[PDB]
RNA sequence: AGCCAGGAUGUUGGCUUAGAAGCAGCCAUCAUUUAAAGAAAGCGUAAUAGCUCACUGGUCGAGUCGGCCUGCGCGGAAGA
């Protein structure tokens, strides 16, 4: 995953979740869109 | 890169960027990028933010630039002591108070306008907002 | 979806068709094809024109709000998908059988062809019509 | 009638017998041979016209050959000899390319009625007229 | 196009800002041979009113002390950057 | 919101004949059958096919996607 300070919803299947304080963007279609932080 | 074609004086005082802006209403175009924050925009930043707009909306549409530099900023070279004269003019800046309309746009959709102004707003140091031309 | 006026217009339009109608027929494409669309509705053109509104909206309270005013027996038909194919020219026309005949001609299923209301009857394939 | 087994609508100008660069691998993708679209292909084509693209159903089975029923040539290829300009589209709204009236397209509309689907003739008339709207040919009604 | 509006008693910089920081804003009604009338009114209404294009053209009837005064919005002061009104000049 | 449904015959449409075929780029952005369908928002193809979504149906059936105005927070946030 990426750890950029400005995570955002790249594709349609991307989904924002707040796990353990950290904001993460989990995705079904492309694992490339998986990203943490920010 | 925007700059005054000839001026009275080469070097100008620092001054104080205070008060509210005057170019507040959207005059020419339908939409506009208003400056929320206080600051000063360089000649490069304006060009960079213009390029980001003009390329987003393509050949279509019409853009204005309500702000212009006309304030030379001096800078002292590296490894130079204090005094021994005012420094040389490096770049040119426009002082931006809150409320000042920076850019104005016309002949495009409202949906595609906001996205074009985001790309410009990203280039600029000052915090900005979208404003529409209200009739009186 | 649009406002209560736009929804009311559609039903009040359907109620006026029952006033100047007679026979009807169900149809449920639980695996339709648009090549089928233009047979059962192509037929309606071969009858005469556009007027034959199949109006497939039998929802428990949508076309069944117009039921209380016109033909109360069709409330029980509500369960499972149904299309109220209202007719106009010719009393008891040939549009009833054609849904059952098309069902065999590549349409998977057709609501178990239960029928609507002329003698207040149920699931009956009836060739006995005026021709 | 059977569902989707392996039928596809695909071939260039029906006069072009046995196309290898235009189609080639597609019609010979399945167990059907390359020779089948040459002898049997020009059997029905020579009745109507050559130098004209026309489609056909390719319902392939496990026997060897396939059953088929031809349909009808499409809108704008017919609107070349009928329309006038060989080029169709380019910049219609910015620059009107050509123009056609209702009288021609209404008359041309009904000739395909064996394949065409609708109620009245006037119904498919504004469709097969309409096909002109979308070639930079704003219909002269 | 009808708004209830109170009459002003305190007027200046201190009063106006206190007012503006209370979901309201100052306006004024003037025209004809009569004297001008300084008019306090609510913000959240008039903010929603100005969205319609009729506001800056048609006649508005402002309700003050029972009496309904017929006016047109001549001039208006926007807040520099925030989307909110500071003041309205109602010509009679 | 979910859930078995439908979501077209010509469109290999002209185009630079190597193809653009609802979806590289051109623009048009048909109108019929009609509960509905843009000659199409995305995926997938040498291009097709094909799968989705717009929409429309029927089931369970009640409150619900979104934008400013703000009160406090969250990440951004590594040194001997
Ligand atoms: Mg980091
Ligand atoms: Mg990194
Ligand atoms: Mg953990
Ligand atoms: Mg100059
Ligand atoms: Mg001073
Ligand atoms: Mg000044
Ligand atoms: Mg001025
Ligand atoms: Mg005084
Ligand atoms: Mg003070
Ligand atoms: Mg006077
Ligand atoms: Mg805070
Ligand atoms: Mg830290
Ligand atoms: Mg740090
Ligand atoms: Mg660090
Ligand atoms: Mg660390």
XYZ file of C-alpha atoms (C1' of nucleotides) and ligand atoms in Angstrom:
633
model
C 0.000 0.000 0.000
C 0.791 3.707 -0.153
C 1.186 5.886 2.968
C 0.488 9.294 1.436
C -0.875 12.156 3.550
C -3.831 12.762 1.174
C -5.634 9.462 0.572
C -8.675 9.651 -1.699
C -11.252 7.507 -3.490
C -9.549 6.668 -6.807
C -11.961 4.206 -8.480
C -15.639 3.369 -7.799
C -15.054 0.240 -5.668
C -12.643 2.117 -3.336
C -13.955 2.462 0.222
C -12.822 4.617 3.160
C -12.432 2.981 6.602
C -11.021 4.243 9.922
C -9.146 1.326 11.549
C -7.403 1.947 14.908
C -7.386 5.750 14.361
C -5.738 5.637 10.909
C -7.802 6.402 7.780
C -7.407 3.718 5.088
C -8.829 3.323 1.563
C -9.531 -0.372 0.900
C -10.407 -1.490 -2.652
C -11.922 -4.609 -4.265
C -10.984 -4.199 -7.954
C -7.352 -2.978 -7.900
C -5.018 -3.657 -4.934
C -2.997 -0.664 -6.265
C -5.700 1.632 -4.802
C -5.051 0.252 -1.281
C -3.619 3.165 0.745
C -3.134 4.291 4.361
C -2.819 7.493 6.393
C -3.990 11.086 5.978
C 5.780 35.519 -16.830
C 3.841 38.702 -15.951
C 5.804 41.880 -15.186
C 5.317 45.649 -15.602
C 6.627 46.932 -18.939
C 8.727 49.787 -17.446
C 8.150 51.437 -14.028
C 8.895 54.764 -12.316
C 11.112 53.198 -9.643
C 13.095 49.950 -9.659
C 12.932 49.014 -5.965
C 9.902 49.477 -3.697
C 9.398 49.346 0.086
C 8.224 46.189 1.829
C 4.999 47.721 3.146
C 2.192 45.912 4.960
C -0.485 43.788 3.271
C -3.494 44.777 5.422
C -7.241 45.351 5.246
C -9.822 43.737 2.977
C -9.710 43.452 -0.822
C -11.470 45.758 -3.311
C -11.902 43.607 -6.454
C -14.528 41.522 -4.652
C -17.468 41.176 -7.070
C -17.282 38.925 -10.140
C -17.349 41.546 -12.912
C -16.414 40.097 -16.323
C -16.926 36.303 -16.352
C -19.657 34.081 -14.892
C -17.466 32.316 -12.292
C -14.443 33.323 -10.231
C -11.683 32.175 -7.879
C -11.891 34.392 -4.785
C -9.026 34.567 -2.270
C -10.224 33.607 1.225
C -6.753 33.816 2.776
C -4.291 36.709 2.995
C -0.967 36.650 1.116
C 1.062 37.598 -1.965
C 1.108 35.833 -5.364
C 4.331 35.739 -7.412
C 4.523 36.191 -11.203
C 5.350 32.459 -11.568
C 2.425 31.226 -9.414
C -0.093 33.201 -11.501
C 1.272 31.708 -14.749
C 1.382 28.206 -13.206
C -2.215 28.545 -11.952
C -3.303 29.988 -15.343
C -1.666 27.072 -17.227
C -3.477 24.629 -14.889
C -6.847 26.282 -15.687
C -6.418 26.853 -19.439
C -5.267 23.249 -20.004
C -8.192 21.808 -17.962
C -10.948 23.632 -19.893
C -9.114 23.082 -23.261
C -9.379 25.602 -26.176
C -12.990 26.502 -25.206
C -14.015 29.143 -22.649
C -12.598 32.549 -21.700
C -10.344 33.395 -18.724
C -9.458 36.714 -17.039
C -6.647 37.505 -14.584
C -7.896 40.211 -12.198
C -4.580 40.306 -10.251
C -1.281 41.706 -11.575
C 2.152 41.854 -9.822
C 3.464 45.505 -10.069
C 5.461 45.076 -6.811
C 9.148 44.138 -7.143
C 10.591 41.863 -4.457
C 14.296 42.197 -3.772
C 16.569 39.415 -2.564
C 20.082 39.513 -1.139
C 22.566 36.975 -2.598
C 23.931 33.962 -0.686
C 27.017 34.531 1.532
C 26.364 38.303 1.726
C 26.475 40.439 4.892
C 23.815 42.916 6.009
C 23.761 46.485 4.711
C 25.794 47.832 1.777
C 22.589 48.645 -0.157
C 19.078 47.418 -0.922
C 19.091 44.011 -2.635
C 18.438 43.276 -6.311
C 14.890 42.728 -7.649
C 14.438 38.975 -8.221
C 10.698 38.413 -8.714
C 7.426 40.356 -8.885
C 4.415 39.849 -6.592
C 0.770 40.920 -6.293
C -0.378 41.536 -2.706
C -3.634 39.657 -2.051
C -6.018 40.641 0.737
C -9.063 38.547 1.707
C -11.993 38.905 -0.721
C -9.892 39.546 -3.858
C -11.085 37.822 -7.042
C -7.992 36.309 -8.694
C -9.299 34.563 -11.807
C -12.591 34.791 -13.649
C -14.027 32.348 -16.190
C -16.808 32.335 -18.814
C -18.344 30.062 -21.469
C -18.067 26.736 -19.604
C -20.297 24.473 -17.456
C -20.588 24.903 -13.657
C -19.621 21.226 -13.202
C -16.417 21.547 -15.267
C -15.586 25.036 -13.876
C -15.029 23.989 -10.222
C -12.659 21.190 -11.281
C -10.614 23.680 -13.360
C -10.367 26.092 -10.389
C -9.268 23.270 -8.027
C -6.242 22.618 -10.274
C -5.337 26.337 -10.113
C -6.160 26.630 -6.383
C -3.674 23.786 -5.789
C -0.842 25.855 -7.371
C -1.475 28.939 -5.203
C -0.239 29.536 -1.602
C -3.412 31.390 -0.552
C -6.591 29.561 0.492
C -9.280 30.173 -2.158
C -12.997 29.651 -2.876
C -15.408 29.482 -5.840
C -17.749 32.456 -6.471
C -20.578 32.950 -9.004
C -21.626 36.260 -10.603
C -24.853 37.261 -8.828
C -27.032 39.871 -10.577
C -26.808 42.914 -8.247
C -38.837 9.457 -9.045
C -41.019 12.511 -9.824
C -43.799 13.998 -7.652
C -47.230 12.636 -6.576
C -48.792 14.576 -9.495
C -46.602 12.744 -12.057
C -47.341 9.404 -10.376
C -51.080 10.238 -10.128
C -51.168 11.212 -13.827
C -49.844 7.736 -14.772
C -52.477 5.880 -12.682
C -55.377 8.242 -13.553
C -54.320 7.658 -17.198
C -54.530 3.869 -16.573
C -57.974 4.131 -14.872
C -59.449 5.931 -17.930
C -58.285 3.025 -20.159
C -60.280 0.521 -18.036
C -63.417 2.687 -18.512
C -63.075 2.243 -22.305
C -61.803 -1.364 -22.282
C -62.820 -4.988 -21.671
C -60.371 -7.944 -21.868
C -56.844 -8.003 -20.416
C -53.901 -10.421 -20.181
C -50.934 -10.931 -17.841
C -47.285 -11.308 -18.869
C -44.146 -11.881 -16.765
C -40.765 -12.093 -18.450
C -38.679 -13.641 -15.638
C -36.070 -14.171 -18.341
C -37.246 -12.001 -21.240
C -35.389 -10.797 -24.318
C -35.912 -7.493 -26.213
C -36.277 -9.547 -29.402
C -39.454 -10.763 -27.594
C -40.416 -7.151 -26.633
C -41.100 -6.558 -30.343
C -43.548 -9.441 -30.750
C -46.133 -9.008 -27.963
C -45.847 -5.198 -28.313
C -45.224 -5.366 -32.110
C -48.650 -7.091 -32.187
C -50.215 -3.940 -30.646
C -48.968 -2.026 -33.695
C -50.509 -4.652 -35.987
C -53.779 -4.007 -34.103
C -53.600 -0.251 -34.888
C -51.165 1.986 -32.920
C -49.643 3.300 -29.667
C -52.770 3.469 -27.398
C -52.399 -0.149 -26.137
C -50.640 0.659 -22.888
C -49.349 -2.611 -21.362
C -48.578 -0.610 -18.120
C -46.554 -3.142 -16.160
C -46.843 -1.679 -12.644
C -48.981 -4.073 -10.541
C -47.276 -3.050 -7.230
C -49.363 -3.895 -4.099
C -50.578 -0.253 -3.906
C -49.646 1.361 -7.318
C -52.002 -0.099 -9.969
C -53.915 -1.640 -7.023
C -54.887 1.932 -5.949
C -56.802 2.182 -9.249
C -58.275 -1.288 -8.513
C -60.826 -0.067 -5.840
C -62.296 2.293 -8.475
C -62.153 -0.206 -11.403
C -62.412 -4.041 -11.170
C -61.810 -5.157 -7.546
C -60.923 -8.801 -8.440
C -57.456 -7.762 -9.778
C -56.153 -7.068 -6.211
C -55.450 -10.815 -5.716
C -53.449 -10.869 -8.996
C -50.952 -8.382 -7.405
C -48.558 -11.064 -5.984
C -45.701 -11.868 -8.452
C -44.995 -9.708 -11.540
C -47.983 -8.895 -13.789
C -48.683 -6.459 -16.663
C -52.233 -5.110 -17.088
C -52.452 -5.165 -20.905
C -55.575 -3.044 -21.487
C -57.280 -3.417 -24.892
C -59.470 -0.998 -26.905
C -60.787 -1.996 -30.384
C -62.850 -5.207 -30.590
C -64.608 -6.680 -27.543
C -62.494 -9.643 -26.330
C -59.700 -9.346 -28.924
C -56.989 -11.872 -29.918
C -54.343 -10.171 -27.694
C -55.038 -12.590 -24.777
C -53.868 -15.816 -26.489
C -50.791 -14.240 -28.169
C -49.061 -13.853 -24.762
C -49.534 -17.614 -24.185
C -48.501 -18.412 -27.792
C -45.415 -16.142 -27.593
C -44.382 -17.845 -24.306
C -43.651 -21.008 -26.329
C -41.980 -18.908 -29.077
C -38.778 -18.124 -27.102
C -39.820 -16.206 -23.952
C -38.765 -18.581 -21.080
C -41.931 -17.923 -18.977
C -45.075 -15.742 -18.970
C -46.574 -15.406 -15.449
C -48.007 -18.959 -15.712
C -50.587 -17.254 -18.048
C -53.277 -16.811 -15.336
C -55.418 -14.216 -17.195
C -57.493 -11.232 -16.025
C -61.286 -10.547 -16.207
C -64.110 -11.210 -18.698
C -66.175 -13.946 -16.953
C -64.101 -13.492 -13.718
C -62.058 -16.657 -14.412
C -58.572 -17.995 -13.581
C -55.731 -19.723 -15.549
C -57.546 -20.873 -18.731
C -56.160 -21.024 -22.292
C -59.156 -19.875 -24.370
C -59.297 -20.019 -28.181
C -63.070 -19.336 -27.955
C -63.132 -15.600 -28.781
C -64.897 -13.388 -31.382
C -62.990 -13.483 -34.713
C -35.333 -21.485 -30.474
C -32.018 -21.822 -28.588
C -30.167 -19.170 -26.526
C -26.581 -17.778 -26.895
C -24.331 -20.638 -28.062
C -21.853 -18.942 -30.449
C -23.677 -16.462 -32.761
C -21.968 -13.175 -33.737
C -22.853 -10.470 -36.304
C -19.653 -9.706 -38.241
C -18.472 -9.273 -41.858
C -17.358 -6.424 -44.171
C -18.734 -5.734 -47.726
C -20.610 -8.899 -48.813
C -18.948 -8.710 -52.252
C -15.561 -9.248 -50.551
C -15.539 -13.069 -50.581
C -13.265 -14.784 -48.010
C -11.925 -11.781 -45.999
C -8.606 -12.471 -44.192
C -7.383 -8.924 -43.331
C -10.919 -7.507 -42.700
C -12.287 -10.361 -40.526
C -10.236 -13.584 -40.945
C -9.616 -15.122 -37.445
C -13.071 -14.126 -36.061
C -15.212 -16.242 -38.423
C -12.590 -19.028 -38.136
C -12.308 -18.700 -34.329
C -14.720 -21.584 -33.650
C -14.752 -25.062 -35.288
C -16.280 -23.569 -38.482
C -13.814 -23.473 -41.415
C -12.503 -20.439 -43.360
C -13.918 -21.882 -46.638
C -17.542 -21.729 -45.340
C -17.603 -17.908 -45.670
C -17.022 -17.876 -49.449
C -19.140 -20.521 -51.229
C -22.207 -20.337 -48.953
C -21.644 -16.608 -48.231
C -22.118 -15.479 -51.869
C -25.184 -17.748 -52.412
C -27.600 -15.187 -50.898
C -25.444 -12.082 -51.641
C -25.662 -12.339 -55.465
C -29.491 -12.007 -55.429
C -29.587 -8.454 -53.998
C -26.290 -6.577 -54.645
C -22.463 -6.688 -54.367
C -20.216 -3.941 -52.994
C -22.718 -3.813 -50.126
C -22.152 -4.920 -46.509
C -24.957 -7.231 -45.156
C -25.120 -9.218 -41.818
C -26.070 -12.855 -41.017
C -26.610 -15.150 -37.966
C -23.742 -17.586 -37.154
C -25.378 -20.147 -34.804
C -22.572 -22.758 -34.723
C -23.326 -26.390 -33.759
C -21.210 -29.536 -33.199
C -22.125 -30.991 -36.653
C -19.817 -29.040 -39.044
C -21.702 -26.204 -40.804
C -24.181 -23.708 -39.259
C -27.818 -22.655 -39.803
C -28.377 -19.018 -40.846
C -30.930 -16.370 -41.893
C -29.659 -13.055 -43.361
C -31.125 -9.719 -42.202
C -30.534 -6.256 -43.794
C -27.781 -3.644 -44.561
C -27.296 -0.840 -41.957
C -28.390 2.787 -42.036
C -25.472 5.045 -43.082
C -23.744 2.659 -45.589
C -27.092 2.817 -47.407
C -26.864 6.621 -46.893
C -23.831 6.996 -49.205
C -25.279 6.195 -52.625
C -28.629 7.438 -51.231
C -27.250 10.470 -49.337
C -24.571 11.630 -51.808
C -21.469 12.422 -49.751
C -19.220 9.390 -49.167
C -18.044 10.874 -45.852
C -20.698 10.781 -43.137
C -19.584 12.478 -39.977
C -16.878 14.846 -38.738
C -18.233 18.169 -37.419
C -22.154 18.191 -37.735
C -23.189 20.781 -35.079
C -20.067 22.909 -35.566
C -20.421 22.546 -39.399
C -23.470 20.856 -41.055
C -21.977 18.163 -43.338
C -25.016 17.448 -45.555
C -28.830 17.159 -45.622
C -31.688 14.742 -46.532
C -35.504 15.203 -46.662
C -38.369 13.089 -45.252
C -39.734 11.934 -48.655
C -36.621 9.871 -49.525
C -35.890 8.382 -46.093
C -39.579 7.517 -45.477
C -39.611 5.651 -48.819
C -36.258 3.956 -48.072
C -37.484 3.079 -44.514
C -40.280 0.645 -45.468
C -38.140 -1.477 -47.869
C -36.360 -3.067 -44.851
C -39.690 -3.910 -43.068
C -38.951 -7.669 -43.298
C -36.086 -7.050 -40.839
C -37.334 -3.789 -39.226
C -39.502 -3.843 -36.091
C -42.299 -1.353 -35.324
C -46.050 -0.631 -35.502
C -46.815 1.740 -38.372
C -44.690 2.792 -41.363
C -44.655 6.403 -40.040
C -43.252 4.925 -36.797
C -40.053 3.420 -38.300
C -40.054 6.318 -40.816
C -38.784 8.800 -38.191
C -36.259 6.160 -37.007
C -34.796 5.456 -40.446
C -35.042 9.216 -41.123
C -33.436 9.735 -37.745
C -30.427 7.693 -38.812
C -29.703 10.685 -41.106
C -29.944 13.227 -38.201
C -26.802 11.536 -36.917
C -24.541 11.935 -39.963
C -24.395 15.750 -39.974
C -27.639 15.615 -41.967
C -30.200 17.767 -40.135
C -33.445 16.290 -41.504
C -35.233 18.605 -43.977
C -38.758 18.177 -42.573
C -41.582 37.803 -0.647
C -42.634 39.064 2.813
C -40.237 39.531 5.779
C -40.774 40.683 9.375
C -38.187 43.247 10.486
C -37.511 45.162 13.725
C -36.701 48.878 14.051
C -33.118 49.776 15.036
C -32.330 51.744 18.226
C -28.529 51.379 18.556
C -26.610 52.147 15.350
C -22.873 52.406 14.655
C -19.911 50.019 14.573
C -20.435 48.485 18.031
C -24.163 47.822 17.564
C -23.950 46.610 13.953
C -21.226 44.003 14.676
C -23.034 42.766 17.826
C -26.138 42.481 15.622
C -24.302 40.721 12.732
C -22.882 38.282 15.255
C -26.473 37.312 16.257
C -27.994 35.692 13.091
C -29.310 39.108 11.909
C -28.018 42.088 9.901
C -28.841 45.811 9.521
C -30.720 47.267 6.541
C -32.402 50.577 5.689
C -35.634 51.628 3.976
C -35.802 55.025 2.218
C -37.582 56.902 -0.592
C -40.182 59.590 -1.292
C -40.876 62.622 0.914
C -40.793 60.541 4.153
C -37.793 60.117 6.474
C -35.469 57.057 6.212
C -36.029 54.030 8.477
C -33.168 51.875 9.823
C -34.327 48.251 9.930
C -32.879 45.215 11.759
C -33.744 41.834 10.177
C -32.894 38.111 10.211
C -29.988 36.716 8.163
C -31.002 33.109 7.416
C -34.229 34.151 5.633
C -32.776 36.930 3.456
C -29.779 34.709 2.610
C -32.222 32.105 1.205
C -34.320 34.855 -0.448
C -31.502 36.284 -2.625
C -30.963 32.953 -4.476
C -34.109 33.716 -6.515
C -33.548 36.214 -9.367
C -36.887 37.964 -8.622
C -35.420 39.383 -5.355
C -33.314 41.992 -7.215
C -36.185 43.237 -9.438
C -39.673 42.593 -7.992
C -41.382 44.476 -5.139
C -40.864 43.218 -1.560
C -43.278 44.073 1.282
C -41.272 44.420 4.525
C -43.343 44.108 7.730
C -42.395 46.647 10.443
C -44.437 47.360 13.623
C -47.577 46.029 11.869
C -47.138 48.243 8.779
C -46.139 46.606 5.465
C -43.755 48.826 3.439
C -43.341 48.253 -0.327
C -39.688 48.404 -1.485
C -37.070 47.263 -4.017
C -33.524 46.181 -3.097
C -31.404 48.954 -4.648
C -27.915 48.233 -3.303
C -26.365 45.455 -1.213
C -23.136 44.763 0.724
C -21.705 41.237 0.511
C -19.282 39.990 3.169
C -15.805 40.001 1.449
C -15.202 36.196 1.215
C -17.726 34.340 3.437
C -21.084 33.701 1.683
C -23.203 36.129 3.736
C -24.869 39.568 3.546
C -23.759 42.594 5.604
C -26.312 45.263 4.615
C -29.162 46.035 2.165
C -30.421 49.401 0.838
C -34.199 49.195 0.245
C -35.401 51.969 -2.119
C -39.134 52.775 -1.862
C -31.173 -0.889 0.444
C -31.097 -5.304 -1.026
C -33.570 -9.569 -4.440
C -34.948 -13.810 -9.539
C -36.311 -9.714 -14.025
C -35.778 -6.900 -18.646
C -32.220 -3.411 -20.339
C -33.285 -4.420 -29.053
C -33.529 -5.949 -35.372
C -30.617 -3.400 -39.059
C -25.324 0.366 -36.256
C -19.476 -4.507 -40.307
C -23.308 2.954 -40.273
C -20.678 6.533 -43.268
C -15.439 7.934 -41.756
C -8.329 8.222 -43.972
C -12.110 1.216 -47.172
C -6.255 -1.874 -42.264
C -10.417 -1.473 -38.285
C -12.940 1.187 -35.099
C -18.978 -2.394 -34.531
C -22.967 1.908 -27.978
C -17.660 3.001 -25.819
C -9.163 6.012 -29.625
C -10.652 10.289 -32.256
C -14.612 12.809 -35.292
C -19.237 15.317 -34.354
C -24.626 13.827 -34.764
C -26.255 12.242 -30.040
C -31.903 8.723 -34.164
C -36.868 7.634 -33.632
C -39.777 3.659 -33.338
C -41.969 -1.170 -30.062
C -43.185 0.675 -25.316
C -43.013 -1.331 -18.407
C -38.540 0.898 -19.906
C -33.322 1.632 -22.891
C -28.131 6.787 -23.606
C -27.498 4.922 -30.507
C -24.683 4.982 -24.019
C -21.319 6.368 -17.424
C -17.686 2.091 -16.791
C -15.222 -2.724 -17.569
C -13.611 -6.069 -21.621
C -11.759 -6.500 -27.199
C -6.956 -6.151 -33.232
C -12.420 -4.716 -33.615
C -16.682 -7.990 -32.216
C -18.712 -10.924 -28.637
C -19.600 -10.462 -23.533
C -20.477 -8.219 -18.301
C -22.181 -3.917 -15.577
C -24.694 0.786 -14.792
C -28.307 4.492 -16.407
C -33.630 3.491 -16.350
C -38.012 0.537 -15.922
C -40.873 -3.770 -13.752
C -42.354 -6.878 -9.763
C -41.194 -8.470 -4.230
C -39.436 -6.918 1.617
C -41.067 -2.492 2.644
C -39.216 2.932 5.729
C -37.040 7.644 5.892
C -32.732 8.662 3.027
C -28.346 9.786 -0.574
C -25.822 14.368 -1.149
C -23.466 20.589 -0.657
C -22.276 25.236 1.876
C -22.438 27.713 7.454
C -19.993 26.342 11.488
C -18.289 24.006 17.622
C -14.569 20.755 19.008
C -11.474 16.684 17.421
C -8.313 12.976 13.620
C -3.833 12.228 10.112
C 0.020 15.101 7.944
C 3.898 14.719 12.689
C 11.532 11.905 12.227
C 17.515 13.451 16.221
C 20.777 12.655 18.511
Mg 5.110 9.495 5.417
Mg 6.508 7.524 0.739
Mg -3.509 -3.116 13.892
Mg 2.518 45.585 -20.486
Mg 1.654 52.682 6.430
Mg -7.093 50.449 -2.083
Mg -13.228 50.474 -7.070
Mg -24.135 59.681 13.415
Mg -14.550 49.097 17.988
Mg -38.618 60.663 -4.357
Mg -11.309 23.208 15.909
Mg 4.427 12.461 16.244
Mg 8.613 15.943 12.599
Mg 8.979 12.560 10.262
Mg 9.106 7.111 13.267
